[PDB]
Design a protein around this nucleic acid. Structure first.
Ligand SMILES: [Mg+2]
Ligand SMILES: [Mg+2]
Ligand SMILES: [Mg+2]
Ligand SMILES: [Mg+2]
Ligand SMILES: [Mg+2]
Ligand SMILES: [Mg+2]
Ligand SMILES: [Mg+2]
Ligand SMILES: [Mg+2]
Ligand SMILES: [Mg+2]
Ligand SMILES: [Mg+2]
Ligand SMILES: [Mg+2]
Ligand SMILES: [Mg+2]
Ligand SMILES: [Mg+2]
Ligand SMILES: [Mg+2]
Ligand SMILES: [Mg+2]
Ligand SMILES: [Mg+2]
Ligand SMILES: [Mg+2]
Ligand SMILES: [Mg+2]
Ligand SMILES: [Mg+2]
Ligand SMILES: [Mg+2]
Ligand SMILES: [Mg+2]
Ligand SMILES: [Mg+2]
Ligand SMILES: [Mg+2]
Ligand SMILES: [Mg+2]
Ligand SMILES: [Mg+2]
Ligand SMILES: [Mg+2]
Ligand SMILES: [Mg+2]
Ligand SMILES: [Mg+2]
Ligand SMILES: [Mg+2]
Ligand SMILES: [Mg+2]
Ligand SMILES: [Mg+2]
Ligand SMILES: [Mg+2]
Ligand SMILES: [Mg+2]
Ligand SMILES: [Mg+2]
Ligand SMILES: [Mg+2]
Ligand SMILES: [Mg+2]
Ligand SMILES: [Mg+2]
Ligand SMILES: [Mg+2]
Ligand SMILES: [Mg+2]
Ligand SMILES: [Mg+2]
Ligand SMILES: [Mg+2]
Ligand SMILES: [Mg+2]
Ligand SMILES: [Mg+2]
Lengths: 117, 195, 63, 137, 110
RNA sequence: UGUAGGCGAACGAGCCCUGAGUAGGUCGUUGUUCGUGAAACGAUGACUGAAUCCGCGCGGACCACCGCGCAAGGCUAAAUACUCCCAGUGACCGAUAGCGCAUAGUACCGUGAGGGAAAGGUGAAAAGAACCCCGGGAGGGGAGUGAAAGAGAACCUGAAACCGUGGACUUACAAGCAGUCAUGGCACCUUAUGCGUGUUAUGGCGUGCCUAUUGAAGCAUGAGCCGGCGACUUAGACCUGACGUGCGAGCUUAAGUUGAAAAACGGAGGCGGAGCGAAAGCGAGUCCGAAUAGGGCGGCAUUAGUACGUCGGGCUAGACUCGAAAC
RNA sequence: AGCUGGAGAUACGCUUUGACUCGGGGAUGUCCGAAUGGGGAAACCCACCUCGUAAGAGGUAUCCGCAAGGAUGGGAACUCAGGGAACUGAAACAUCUCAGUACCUGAAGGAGAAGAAAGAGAAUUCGAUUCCGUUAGUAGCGGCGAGCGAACCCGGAUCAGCCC
């Protein structure tokens, strides 16, 4: 029994070409380069999914020391004062949302600063 | 679990071999038989010598194209297959006690459900097919099941062979696959059913 | 079919036993011999160890 | 059965090795390494410096006897059995060999076998249990 | 290249035989066999109306015509009829000499 | 139209003698497993050259005995091989497949011997588009035919590269393996108002692929792009292992024979059952040897074998595919 | 009862005193070709002898034989025979193998070969030849290396021995 490739190959090809649809030039329309661009695409995907936490952690911290210094403390001293009172265990992201609500942030700043004295 | 026909109606023996081996033995048997009937006719152009061709196509180097030397190569379109089919005999001897145990398990898969036995009692006139339909229809063979009959008198089989739901099987030439195949079995009783 | 390399037929390979490969002792056979007497009495029949698989197919039929 | 319910016994048929066929299994090179004589068949079995070579002491013929132990024999419960005749119907397979008996376990009860050859002690444990043993005369 | 007679260049109708159509839009219409083309399996009966068009051609005339014509058909008409229409055909009955194999359904001729 | 069945032809093919220039020999040589080996025998080139039935040739140097056989005259069916050709059939191909050819050893290449292609598809049926329009045309638009003209003869489908037309979002201080995550702007809502689809701006991040490599983004190899052909196979009474099945101290056939819409018979033969020895040969013992020290081996664990199937390896043969310069 | 080749196209017509088409024989059958009257660059040149009106017909090569009458050439693979490779393996390479393979050439048929024991062989058995299974990779041959490899017994297919 013969069994030519036929419909199989072209199914696979169209799948790849359909993953690759934002892409520039023949990264979008030829298979070979489509599949090749997707190789590095997989690398970059799997990297960023756990690096994105690094970036967002940066953005949280970076937003926290801004209000810290806005009041005349700073990130290192302010989280050391929110740690020196045991009871503050909220994530930095929630300290950011508080940095978007100045009154509560200042309440935590005076709380923290009443713990390094 | 056995009765006959118009002739007599006395039980032979209900004894069956092993209980039907759930495909552990029946499967290899029908597979071997389908292989044994199978013929090996599948030629294909030889990876070289069968094709019609000549010599070295062009120069070994400095032509500036891929290194090659004949028109009859499997990577060439022109044909000659690497690893194509050739005639071969798939037949082999299944050891005999497996053939016998297989037929016995087939009959045993017939008894604990869909088998029937017959002396004669055919009451077939001039091998008329119509009388055959009547005779079997009184026995519940109303054409809503597949049928394998095994007789030896050429008149009754000559009556039956044109029905779409029955097939005729002469003499001892019984087939584990023919009876696994149909959904009913009717046996001469007078022949292989006894010793 | 198969064959057995005829060199192994009468050579220091005895398939006999539980499938193991007895073999001769070699050093100083019929070349010069003017040395130790308990050495020259020590060229008879011992057996090999990490080669046996090759010798079997040398002569599975045990000639 | 109905035949589309047929299945061969589990593990009675393993599939093939599709050596080749890419990165999910056994890829670029098949099982073969990188280079060397893993290319197209040829070499067989020899180290290709030296043969492992030893001397040869040499002879050409032999002629064995067919074997008949007396331990399988004592269990027979039907003695006075002729060699060729009454042994052919219960094994003793070779047709172009001579028969003989060995002294494997105890003869016990009396018998009268007519073997083509016998060990010197088989007459001991045979006639000691009253038993004529007739070699061809 | 495929001969078109799986019917062995046999024909169940003579030329001029009255005939009824089994199938197509002409089923149940009536007609004598004007032309019988065995090997091609083509059958002409009056009433298979077809509107062939041509005044492009010069040979008949510088203009020409649309015109009504026959369209020959497959042996998919009933070959022969009777006061009962359609139906099969027994043969081998004898003529007044018996040298003519003839036709019958239930009974009759031609 | 056939099929089962039945008929079917004037002419038609087909069941005292019994082999001499020889047997034999020497010299050169050779065939069977026969490579001068202890080399018999046949076989012939050269030179020679017997015997008759109380006779001749052979029995693997040679001899005696003991056996087989009568050479130097001829003919002889069948079983055996092939397949230009015919039928039948197919876990064979179905237009790059399959023969090279859906026909063609043509076209074409060669002074020549010789090499050597692509192949196809309206439609049910031609009803194969009257007639009108723009155009010399070609091509096209109407009309009709037709079920379909989303079939119209560049006539089944009509994928991809590749070329265009139109619309969303976008783009002219930008540095860039072409992406990845995130946030915003615009568009849209038929697996779809969402943890949405398309696009996009900015931020961060980020050395094509394969190969060959100590080491590859490499300025190391291959590759214009899409399609499609394209490489670990087959064989065998083979050896070896794993798994499974039948039977099991036993297990099984081969060639074939008789049947075949089906398989049974077929024990010749193979493997297990005893080993040691260089072998004669002994034999659960055996070889070495002058008797005692060992080697292999059985007891003991008696480890159960064998016929198949599948699969891992091995062999032998193109043996994973392509590729020499040569002979 | 249609036919008038593919071929699809018109015209001309043939057929129920039987067409076509299908089976069977007959009869014509230009020239080349074994080519064969002679020549020759195949398919074309040039002759001679009898019939004899002429158009037209027949003969005119060589080999075997008195004489009939044979033969020459062709044929896909198969057969036998006269010659007879080398790559290659041997991890080099001379003996060896590759192999009596490929190839050339001759003879022939639907087959051919071979064949009716001055045999195999070791039981005082067998009883023509060919072919399959097996004996068996046993014997054995081999720079005793790579490797090369029987036969008898036994089982089948087919079995006839006739003539000088
Ligand atoms: Mg990344
Ligand atoms: Mg280039
Ligand atoms: Mg081809
Ligand atoms: Mg031994
Ligand atoms: Mg794997
Ligand atoms: Mg590689
Ligand atoms: Mg390397
Ligand atoms: Mg080779
Ligand atoms: Mg080898
Ligand atoms: Mg016009
Ligand atoms: Mg000589
Ligand atoms: Mg030599
Ligand atoms: Mg083709
Ligand atoms: Mg194509
Ligand atoms: Mg060709
Ligand atoms: Mg031309
Ligand atoms: Mg056009
Ligand atoms: Mg269109
Ligand atoms: Mg279309
Ligand atoms: Mg057209
Ligand atoms: Mg269609
Ligand atoms: Mg199309
Ligand atoms: Mg700008
Ligand atoms: Mg730029
Ligand atoms: Mg990288
Ligand atoms: Mg380097
Ligand atoms: Mg590069
Ligand atoms: Mg380049
Ligand atoms: Mg063989
Ligand atoms: Mg097992
Ligand atoms: Mg021990
Ligand atoms: Mg196995
Ligand atoms: Mg493996
Ligand atoms: Mg291996
Ligand atoms: Mg090559
Ligand atoms: Mg026509
Ligand atoms: Mg001439
Ligand atoms: Mg001439
Ligand atoms: Mg070499
Ligand atoms: Mg050489
Ligand atoms: Mg040849
Ligand atoms: Mg020849
Ligand atoms: Mg000839």
């Amino acid at each position: 029994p013969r069994a030519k490739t036929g419909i199989v190959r072209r199914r696979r090809h169209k799948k790849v070409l359909k993953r690759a649809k934002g892409f520039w030039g023949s990264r979008s329309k030829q298979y070979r380069n489509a599949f090749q661009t997707l190789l590095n695409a997989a690398t970059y995907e799997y990297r960023d999914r756990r690096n994105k936490k690094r970036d967002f952690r940066r953005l949280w911290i970076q937003r926290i020391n801004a209000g810290a210094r806005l009041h005349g403390m700073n990130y290192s001293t302010f989280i050391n004062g929110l740690k020196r009172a045991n009871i503050d265990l909220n994530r930095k992201v929630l300290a950011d949302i508080a940095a978007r609500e100045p009154e509560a942030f200042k309440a935590l700043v005076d709380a923290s600063r009443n713990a390094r004295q | 679990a056995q009765i006959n026909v118009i002739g007599q109606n006395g039980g032979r023996t209900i004894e069956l071999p092993l209980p039907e081996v759930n495909s552990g033995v029946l499967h290899e048997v029908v597979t071997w038989q389908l292989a044994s009937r199978r013929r090996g006719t599948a030629s294909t152009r030889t990876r070289a010598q069968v094709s019609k061709t000549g010599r070295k196509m062009y120069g070994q180097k400095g032509t500036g194209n891929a290194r090659h030397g004949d028109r009859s190569v499997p990577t060439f379109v022109g044909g000659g297959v690497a690893f194509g089919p050739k005639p071969r005999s798939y037949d082999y001897t299944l050891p005999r006690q497996v053939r016998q145990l297989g037929l016995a398990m087939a009959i045993a898969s017939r008894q604990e459900g869909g088998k029937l036995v017959a002396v004669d009692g055919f009451d077939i006139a001039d091998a008329k097919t119509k009388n055959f339909i009547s005779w079997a229809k009184q026995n519940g063979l109303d054409g809503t099941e597949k049928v394998l009959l095994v007789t030896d008198d050429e008149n009754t089989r000559r009556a039956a062979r044109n029905v779409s739901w029955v097939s005729v099987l002469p003499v001892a030439g019984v087939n584990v696959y023919d009876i696994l195949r149909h959904d009913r079995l009717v046996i001469d009783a007078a022949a292989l059913e006894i010793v | 079919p198969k064959m057995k390399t005829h060199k192994m037929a009468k050579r220091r390979i005895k398939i006999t036993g539980t499938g193991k490969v007895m073999a001769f002792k070699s050093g100083k056979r019929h070349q010069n011999t003017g040395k130790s007497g308990d050495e020259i009495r020590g060229k008879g029949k011992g057996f090999v160890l990490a080669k046996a698989e090759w010798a079997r197919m040398k002569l599975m039929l045990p000639r | 059965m109905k035949l589309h319910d047929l299945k061969p016994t589990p593990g009675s048929r393993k599939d093939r090795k599709r050596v080749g066929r890419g990165p999910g299994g056994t890829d670029k090179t098949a099982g073969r390494g990188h280079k060397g004589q893993k290319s197209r068949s040829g070499a067989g079995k020899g180290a290709f410096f030296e043969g492992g070579r030893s001397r040869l002491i040499a002879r050409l013929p032999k002629r064995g006897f067919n074997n008949v132990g007396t331990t399988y024999e004592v269990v027979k419960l039907s003695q006075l059995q002729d060699l060729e005749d009454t042994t052919f119907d219960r094994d003793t397979l070779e047709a172009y060999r001579l028969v003989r008996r060995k002294n494997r376990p105890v003869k016990l009860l009396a018998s009268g076998e007519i073997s083509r050859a016998v060990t010197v002690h088989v007459d001991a444990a045979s006639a000691a249990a009253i038993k004529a043993v007739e070699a061809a005369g | 290249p495929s001969a078109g007679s799986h019917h062995n260049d046999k024909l169940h109708f003579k030329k001029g035989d009255t005939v009824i159509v089994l199938s197509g839009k002409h089923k149940g219409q009536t007609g004598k066999v004007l032309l019988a083309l065995p090997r091609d399996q083509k059958v002409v009966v009056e009433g298979v109306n077809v509107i062939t068009k041509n005044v492009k051609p010069s040979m008949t005339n510088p203009q020409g015509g649309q015109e009504q014509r026959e369209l020959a058909l497959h042996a998919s008409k009933v070959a022969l009829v009777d006061p009962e229409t359609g139906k099969a055909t027994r043969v081998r009955k004898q003529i007044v000499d018996g040298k003519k194999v003839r036709v019958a359904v239930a009974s009759g001729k031609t």
